[PDB]
Amino acid sequence: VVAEAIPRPEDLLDSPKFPMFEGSTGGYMSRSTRERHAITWTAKGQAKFEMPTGGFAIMNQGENLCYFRKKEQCIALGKQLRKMKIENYKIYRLKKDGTVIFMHPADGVFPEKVNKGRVQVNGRPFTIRGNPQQSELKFTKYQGKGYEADPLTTMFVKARVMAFADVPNLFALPQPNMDELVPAEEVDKYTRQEYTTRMMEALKRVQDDRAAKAAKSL
Amino acid sequence: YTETVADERLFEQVYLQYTSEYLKGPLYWHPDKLQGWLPDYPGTPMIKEGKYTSHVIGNLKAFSSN
Amino acid sequence: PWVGPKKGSWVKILRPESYWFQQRGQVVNVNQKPEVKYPVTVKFDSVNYANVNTNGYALWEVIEAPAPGPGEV
Amino acid sequence: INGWLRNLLWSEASQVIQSYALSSICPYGFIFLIGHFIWAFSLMFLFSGRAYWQELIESILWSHHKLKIIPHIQPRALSISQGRAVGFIHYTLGGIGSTWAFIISRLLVLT
Amino acid sequence: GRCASSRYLQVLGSIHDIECGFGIDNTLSLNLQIFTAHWGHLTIILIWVSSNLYHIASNANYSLWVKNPIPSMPIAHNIWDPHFTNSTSTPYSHTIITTILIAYSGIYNQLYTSGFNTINQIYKTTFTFSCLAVISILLAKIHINTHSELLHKLASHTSQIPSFFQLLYFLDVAISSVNIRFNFHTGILVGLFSIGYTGHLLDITIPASRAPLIHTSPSYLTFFGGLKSNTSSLYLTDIAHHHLAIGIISILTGHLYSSFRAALGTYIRDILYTSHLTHSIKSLHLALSLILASCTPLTSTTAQHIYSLTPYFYLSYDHIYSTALYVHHSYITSFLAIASHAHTAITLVRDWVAPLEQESSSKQIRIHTHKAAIISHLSWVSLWLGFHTLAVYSHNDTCIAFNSPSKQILIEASNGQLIQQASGKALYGTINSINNYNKSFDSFIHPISPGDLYVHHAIALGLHITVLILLKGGLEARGSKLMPDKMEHSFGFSCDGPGRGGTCDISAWDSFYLATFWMLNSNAWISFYFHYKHLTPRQFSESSTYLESWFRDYLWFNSTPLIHGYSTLGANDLSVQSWSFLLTHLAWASGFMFLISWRGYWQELIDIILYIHLKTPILINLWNGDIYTPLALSIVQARFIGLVHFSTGLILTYPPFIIGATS
Amino acid sequence: XXXXXXXXXXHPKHMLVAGVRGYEMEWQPIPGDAVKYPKPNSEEMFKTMIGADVETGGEAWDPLGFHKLFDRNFD
Amino acid sequence: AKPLEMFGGVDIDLEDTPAHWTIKASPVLEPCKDNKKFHKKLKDELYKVKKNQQKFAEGSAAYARFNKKIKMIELRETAYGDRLCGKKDGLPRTIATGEWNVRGSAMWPAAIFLYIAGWIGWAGRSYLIRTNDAAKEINIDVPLAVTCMASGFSWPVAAWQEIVNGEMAVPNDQIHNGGPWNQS
Numbered sequence A: 001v002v003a004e005a006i007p008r009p010e011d012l013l014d015s016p017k018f019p020m021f022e023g024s025t026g027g028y029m030s031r032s033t034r035e036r037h038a039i040t041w042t043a044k045g046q047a048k049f050e051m052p053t054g055g056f057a058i059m060n061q062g063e064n065l066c067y068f069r070k071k072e073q074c075i076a077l078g079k080q081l082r083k084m085k086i087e088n089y090k091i092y093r094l095k096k097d098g099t100v101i102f103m104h105p106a107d108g109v110f111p112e113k114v115n116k117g118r119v120q121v122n123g124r125p126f127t128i129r130g131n132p133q134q135s136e137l138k139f140t141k142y143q144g145k146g147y148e149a150d151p152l153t154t155m156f157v158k159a160r161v162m163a164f165a166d167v168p169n170l171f172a173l174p175q176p177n178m179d180e181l182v183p184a185e186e187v188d189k190y191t192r193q194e195y196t197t198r199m200m201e202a203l204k205r206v207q208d209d210r211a212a213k214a215a216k217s218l
Numbered sequence B: 001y002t003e004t005v006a007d008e009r010l011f012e013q014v015y016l017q018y019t020s021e022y023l024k025g026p027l028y029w030h031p032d033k034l035q036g037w038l039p040d041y042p043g044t045p046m047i048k049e050g051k052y053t054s055h056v057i058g059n060l061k062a063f064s065s066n
Numbered sequence C: 001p002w003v004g005p006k007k008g009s010w011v012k013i014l015r016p017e018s019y020w021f022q023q024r025g026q027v028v029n030v031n032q033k034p035e036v037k038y039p040v041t042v043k044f045d046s047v048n049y050a051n052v053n054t055n056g057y058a059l060w061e062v063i064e065a066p067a068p069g070p071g072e073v
Numbered sequence D: 001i002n003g004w005l006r007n008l009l010w011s012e013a014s015q016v017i018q019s020y021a022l023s024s025i026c027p028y029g030f031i032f033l034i035g036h037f038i039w040a041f042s043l044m045f046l047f048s049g050r051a052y053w054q055e056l057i058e059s060i061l062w063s064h065h066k067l068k069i070i071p072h073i074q075p076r077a078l079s080i081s082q083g084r085a086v087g088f089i090h091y092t093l094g095g096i097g098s099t100w101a102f103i104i105s106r107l108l109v110l111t
Numbered sequence E: 001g002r003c004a005s006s007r008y009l010q011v012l013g014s015i016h017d018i019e020c021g022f023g024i025d026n027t028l029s030l031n032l033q034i035f036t037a038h039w040g041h042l043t044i045i046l047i048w049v050s051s052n053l054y055h056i057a058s059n060a061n062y063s064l065w066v067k068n069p070i071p072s073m074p075i076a077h078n079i080w081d082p083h084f085t086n087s088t089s090t091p092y093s094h095t096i097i098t099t100i101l102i103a104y105s106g107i108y109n110q111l112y113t114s115g116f117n118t119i120n121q122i123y124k125t126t127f128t129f130s131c132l133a134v135i136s137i138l139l140a141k142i143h144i145n146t147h148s149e150l151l152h153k154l155a156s157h158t159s160q161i162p163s164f165f166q167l168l169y170f171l172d173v174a175i176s177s178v179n180i181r182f183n184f185h186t187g188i189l190v191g192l193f194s195i196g197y198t199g200h201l202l203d204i205t206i207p208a209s210r211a212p213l214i215h216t217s218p219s220y221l222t223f224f225g226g227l228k229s230n231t232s233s234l235y236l237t238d239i240a241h242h243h244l245a246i247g248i249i250s251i252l253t254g255h256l257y258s259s260f261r262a263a264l265g266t267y268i269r270d271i272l273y274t275s276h277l278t279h280s281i282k283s284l285h286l287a288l289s290l291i292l293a294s295c296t297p298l299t300s301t302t303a304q305h306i307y308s309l310t311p312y313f314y315l316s317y318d319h320i321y322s323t324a325l326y327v328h329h330s331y332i333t334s335f336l337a338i339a340s341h342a343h344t345a346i347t348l349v350r351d352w353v354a355p356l357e358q359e360s361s362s363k364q365i366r367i368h369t370h371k372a373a374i375i376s377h378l379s380w381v382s383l384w385l386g387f388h389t390l391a392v393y394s395h396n397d398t399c400i401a402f403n404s405p406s407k408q409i410l411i412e413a414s415n416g417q418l419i420q421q422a423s424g425k426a427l428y429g430t431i432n433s434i435n436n437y438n439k440s441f442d443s444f445i446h447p448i449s450p451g452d453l454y455v456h457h458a459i460a461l462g463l464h465i466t467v468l469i470l471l472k473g474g475l476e477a478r479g480s481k482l483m484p485d486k487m488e489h490s491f492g493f494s495c496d497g498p499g500r501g502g503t504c505d506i507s508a509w510d511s512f513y514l515a516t517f518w519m520l521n522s523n524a525w526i527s528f529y530f531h532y533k534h535l536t537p538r539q540f541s542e543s544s545t546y547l548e549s550w551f552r553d554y555l556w557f558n559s560t561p562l563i564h565g566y567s568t569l570g571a572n573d574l575s576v577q578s579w580s581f582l583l584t585h586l587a588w589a590s591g592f593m594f595l596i597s598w599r600g601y602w603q604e605l606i607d608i609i610l611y612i613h614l615k616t617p618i619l620i621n622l623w624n625g626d627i628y629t630p631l632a633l634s635i636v637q638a639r640f641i642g643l644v645h646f647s648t649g650l651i652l653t654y655p656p657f658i659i660g661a662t663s
Numbered sequence F: 001x002x003x004x005x006x007x008x009x010x011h012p013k014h015m016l017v018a019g020v021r022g023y024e025m026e027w028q029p030i031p032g033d034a035v036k037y038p039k040p041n042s043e044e045m046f047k048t049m050i051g052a053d054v055e056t057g058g059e060a061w062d063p064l065g066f067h068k069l070f071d072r073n074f075d
Numbered sequence G: 001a002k003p004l005e006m007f008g009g010v011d012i013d014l015e016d017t018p019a020h021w022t023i024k025a026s027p028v029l030e031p032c033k034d035n036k037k038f039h040k041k042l043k044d045e046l047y048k049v050k051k052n053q054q055k056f057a058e059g060s061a062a063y064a065r066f067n068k069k070i071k072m073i074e075l076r077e078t079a080y081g082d083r084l085c086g087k088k089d090g091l092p093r094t095i096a097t098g099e100w101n102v103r104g105s106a107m108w109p110a111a112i113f114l115y116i117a118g119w120i121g122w123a124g125r126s127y128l129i130r131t132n133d134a135a136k137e138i139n140i141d142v143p144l145a146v147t148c149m150a151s152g153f154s155w156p157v158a159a160w161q162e163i164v165n166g167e168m169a170v171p172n173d174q175i176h177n178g179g180p181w182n183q184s
């Protein structure tokens, strides 16, 4: 798809592409706004239509060009044109510098028609109820945005919910020994792979002690 | 082979069944697993077998029923 | 080999967010493609707020319940 | 404004407010009360949205379905436009009735 | 891109929602911010106390009111307003003397009962409370520094093992610990504070109320009853003994949980786990909800028992103090009651983890399983009460308008009368077994009539409906049939669109917004009941079974002095009351447009106004609107602003009426 | 021939009710009270219980159906 | 020791006997036929209506209608004589203690209303059960509707027989419980 050369509306006064329209106060507010949206189309007959900004208009038998402040007005006019069997209309966003961005028929095929090369953006692979609970994701990446969680996080919190209901079989986290641990950070033994072995043996000692203590009055 | 929705659901079930058992163990360390949180205190199990364990009655756990 | 409930067989909806959760509805058709995630199509006598009386459910959200009976949803 | 409140809505409302058991003006006092009730009743429709009432209706419909009482004309709360229309109608009717009683009872007593 | 005019409202709508802060990353920051805010709030309270004490000391007449309290009137503070007449004399001043305001708070009786005799003592008290405000702010700074010092001590902290990260959860153990807090609150802050106040009474209050006596002997602890005849208040000896008993009981109770040692006391978690609870006690919203639900019975009983059993000297002799205190505390407890439900709903939205679908273990789970039954039965009882109270009131109104007072339906309040008879028999048996009998209990038991029965049914209706709205909002905050994803959204959000039938007022915050109107209405009913029975018990007892009596013999009749305040005949000392009356009517009606008229109309109106501004010669060359773009208030902001206007009008319209009617 | 649904795609149904443990747990250990998992059998065991006699019929005499209320508790 | 002044006006029975459990033994109330306020109120009613009557002509129809109204008022005075009214208002009271045997008791109206209200609800429920269609709710099957309306008289027995036999209620797992509160 080739973007056209839509000029800035303040530099294209009196263009032959402009349809005959009455002109109202509803048009884009100059002297305060510099971002304009332009919609172009090619018609077959001078059929009267309604401008999104109040007032009616008559197309041209050839090319047409209109400028609007908002993309919504351009899309409304596009739907109105498409109701009149007028395809091949393109909607551009004009930056303040004059950069032309091609917006509505982005890949050249209207969004209601399946086109190859598209990928489901903002897709979630479950029913809407499958979203994780907001309470589970507190102070994580998804603090108040449980609907933004990746499906792996949703499954992880679901498994956590499943686990944290069998209370008797849970493992209480041992209380840290603050007074005798906690040396200066430079005082470490390195041996990271040995540190997990130390984790294993210390947790084994904790579990054995807990079992021995429980097997006294239970 | 292509991953049918049934196969994805099977992976969901396998992952959940494995992880729900793994997180109960001594290798997950969640704040909800602290003392005073959901899990029982280390040496003082309150409810087992759906029956109040002897540790419920505190210092009376050593007393006889009679 | 047919998969899912038979056509015209009543099923109880197990989708928690469904408007017809724990209600019953006739099975219109079941899509036989294994790639379809929600193949079971169920129609209901009671329309939801969108005035729609039919919806497609997953294979694990219909339990083949008996007929509703007199004065029963 | 205090002059309007005191010498018009209070002093000149003595005829309508003290109109019980007085032969001609009993209905005017009663209609004054009813107009106040209707005007305040309109505020329930004016201030509230239909989603709360829809959820409450669903909660009640649970109890109805429990006892095999199924209204097949499914109970739905009033549409937003209808809620506004009902609120406006009750508001204007109640206020008009309040003024109506207030002016008519006083002029009937004085004459 | 930047913001629009709605930024101010958006920010101020969650200005204290510390959970919604952007820099806050952990429970440590949240808890420390909350603790510091608590310190600042305590400082504000202390400064307010010192303020009242100062103004009583400086711009007031405590030294003269204490001498002749029954006919005298206290002074709140002077009036310095340049808008008054620089000539003549205002109705609030004795000619050339300064302008004063009569205090309707009740601090004069409080200080007189507590043992104040001189202005100098009040001045020293003001100084001490300002000192305490300084101390509170310095404690806030101290605790901020201590927690930052723990954080810095994590620069010299490592467990030499991968379990070192466990210390993340214990950094705010100072604030989040529950057993120590419960033990020390219930013991010290309640029991020993009561015991210290008993000491204060025995050392000052009882010595500075009667002739000199023995060295504060144990004869200062009496068990008389109520309403000492001369001062028409409770015996100070009885009050000291009551505080002593409460202090001893709460001190004993405060040794329950395991606070400082692991070898003494039971843990709260183990207490809950073996009961019908085991809730998520780490939620701050849950704790806030259930302590607001605790301050509510306390404040409601404060309102009831300040009036029924007046504890302060000559408090019953003030016709305005007794009504103002009751109405104030009733409104405070209504606000706290609705707060409890609002924060329960916020707890369910934000801080509640639920099982998959069927594990009926949590109490909230069991409540949610049959929530429809709860709401349906609450709706049924609300409908019954409303139907049968309004219909009987309508019967009485119609049959009394038709010259037939004897055709009314007057159900004799037999159950309340039986309770009163049992309590009176108990009290009379207590009194008859005394060598110092002939005691009085003031309004502990009051004449109960059919009007009382109907008003109690109306109050029960209001409470039922308020609880209905709040409970429905809480239970369906996480999802209803209409919107089965409500826990994915915020606690307060605009709507769910016009489709699916239309979804205005769908959030749990909208349920709170609807319930606040019913809270205000129920409180208005309670306050009207109390004030009407206070003004004329006889006329209330006879003519209060028909609503026209409430409309005429109370509202229309008792509003005479207030409207006459300022007129074209002169002004009274009720001029401020009448002016505030009209201003609060204007505020109440002004919030109707924020509630009735909704956003889109106004957004179009603002677009038109902005068109004008961008079209006016000089404005367009200075202000294009790109910086702080004016926009209409959002939907939730609009509902909240209308609710604020309505609440302010309804609440603040009443005190002028109370002052005009009683004074 | 209808294919059997695999356990991966099976259904939970609603056999798990509020009177029994959920997916996997143990109920609260109440002291002497209604304990254990209830099952509907009142009316059936009422038709085997003795006490019915010829004064009123000869079969299990229970108008008002007070026996059956246990069986209804589940509904 | 004068409980009236001790409790600020209200008086207490001070006696524990079963004979005082009736409403008729209350010291607040008093039979209407010997109460001063009752006499004064109905005398004022008679006086006002009579004063209105004299304003019209003697032979007019309004005079006869006012005579009929006066007769109605006097009949009301003599009919409420046995009804209990307070010793200070004179307005007769309604008894809501379940007495069943006093003038103005609420037991008889309660029983009558409960019967007819259960009748209405049972007729509606029967019609809804026998017409399981929306078309039958907008276009009422009048013969079936009146059949159910007549059949509703036996509601206190049929409803209980349905309650105990499992034909009124439905298990919660067959109707929509409500909105989901969890899933993750």
Ligand code: CLA
Binding pocket: E586, E589, E590, E591, E592, E593, E596, E597
């Ligand atoms: C008493 C309540 C009340 C009040 C005061 C207003 C006020 C207003 N409404 Mg409104 N409205 C209300 C109720 C009310 N409404 C209700 C119940 C509804 C039903 C939905 C509406 C529906 C409605 C619509 C649909 C429209 C309005 C409009 C207006 C505005 C036009 C009038 C105007 O500009 O005067 C000025 C405003 C005043 C309040 C006059 C008094 C001003 C004070 C006395 C003087 C200044 C005070 C001084 C500066 C003190 C400073 C403040 C202090 C902090 C220092 C105005 C802001 C219209 C509008 O905005 O168009 C322009 C409009 O379109 N209203």
Ligand code: CLA
Binding pocket: D001, D004, D005, D008, D009, D010, D013, D014, D017, D035, D036, D039, D040, D094, D095, D096, D097, D098, D099, D100, D102, E551, E555, E556
């Ligand atoms: C709980 C207290 C309470 C409440 C809530 C109401 C509620 C109401 N009363 Mg009311 N009333 C009460 C107590 C109360 N009454 C008592 C105790 C009395 C003494 C008997 C009265 C006497 C009374 C009378 C005599 C009248 C009402 C009216 C009304 C209705 C006004 C509705 C409306 O839209 O007004 C909108 C308000 C206005 C349009 C303004 C009218 C009031 C002000 C003071 C007029 C001043 C005009 C002035 C030139 C400035 C106007 C500004 C302009 C821009 C609008 C409403 C039903 C009135 C009614 O039916 O409608 C007006 C009416 O006629 N009441």
Ligand code: CLA
Binding pocket: E381, E384, E385, E411, E412, E413, E414, E415, E416, E417, E448, E452, E453, E456, E457, E460, G096, G097, G106, G107, G110, G111, G114
């Ligand atoms: C939803 C129903 C409901 C509710 C919430 C209340 C609430 C209240 N009633 Mg009340 N009352 C009701 C129905 C209700 N009443 C009915 C139907 C009657 C009979 C006319 C009464 C008669 C009554 C009297 C005489 C007194 C109260 C009082 C009170 C207050 C104190 C609580 C108390 O003792 O009540 C008692 C508890 C109940 C009444 C609960 C019963 C609920 C059932 C389901 C209502 C229907 C019963 C049914 C009609 C019986 C039919 C019998 C028939 C088969 C023969 C409280 C505000 C007292 C009061 O306010 O004094 C200051 C008081 O003295 N009530």
Ligand code: CLA
Binding pocket: D059, D060, D061, D063, D064, D067, D069, E376, E377, E379, E380, E383, G120, G121, G122, G123, G124, G125, G127, G128, G140, G144, G145, G146, G148, G149
């Ligand atoms: C067949 C008719 C019928 C029956 C059996 C019931 C039965 C019930 N309703 Mg109900 N209801 C009905 C119609 C009916 N309703 C209608 C038409 C409405 C719309 C106004 C409601 C609105 C309603 C609410 C808002 C609530 C109930 C509640 C309840 C339950 C408690 C009893 C109660 O509150 O009654 C009181 C009933 C009313 C106040 C509604 C008015 C009664 C209508 C007018 C009767 C209509 C009968 C119908 C015309 C019969 C025609 C027969 C003919 C065709 C042959 C109970 C299960 C409550 C609940 O769930 O608590 C458990 C509750 O909160 N109902």
Ligand SMILES: CC1=C(/C=C/C(C)=C/C=C/C(C)=C/C=C/C=C(C)/C=C/C=C(C)/C=C/C2=C(C)CCCC2(C)C)C(C)(C)CCC1
Binding pocket: E039, E040, E041, E043, E044, E047
């Ligand atoms: C709200 C807030 C807060 C606060 C509060 C407060 C606390 C306040 C205060 C206020 C205040 C508290 C104020 C004050 C003021 C004061 C002043 C203003 C003073 C002045 C003085 C002076 C100036 C002095 C002088 C002198 C000297 C120097 C010495 C000698 C003497 C003389 C006098 C000469 C907080 C923190 C919570 C936070 C948030 C916000």
Ligand SMILES: CC1=C(C/C=C(\C)CCC[C@H](C)CCC[C@H](C)CCCC(C)C)C(=O)c2ccccc2C1=O
Binding pocket: D044, D045, D046, D048, D049, D050, D053, D054, D076, D077, D078, D079, D080, D082, D083, D084
């Ligand atoms: C209460 C309320 C409802 C619920 C109210 C409903 C559904 C009204 C319908 C109830 C019946 C059908 C009305 C029939 C008339 C009454 C039963 C009796 C009126 C006459 C009596 C005096 C006899 C809404 O649906 C609603 C929607 C949008 C905004 C606000 C609201 C709103 O405030």
Ligand SMILES: CC1=C(C/C=C(\C)CCC[C@H](C)CCC[C@H](C)CCCC(C)C)C(=O)c2ccccc2C1=O
Binding pocket: E008, E593, E594, E595, E597, E598, E599, E600, E602, E603, E606, E631, E632, E633, E634, E635, E638
């Ligand atoms: C009146 C009204 C408005 C208009 C009110 C607006 C746009 C805001 C009015 C603000 C007033 C005029 C004060 C403006 C503030 C001052 C300029 C001071 C500025 C303070 C900041 C610098 C913080 C709405 O936008 C609206 C939206 C939705 C439902 C109902 C309504 C509604 O009723």
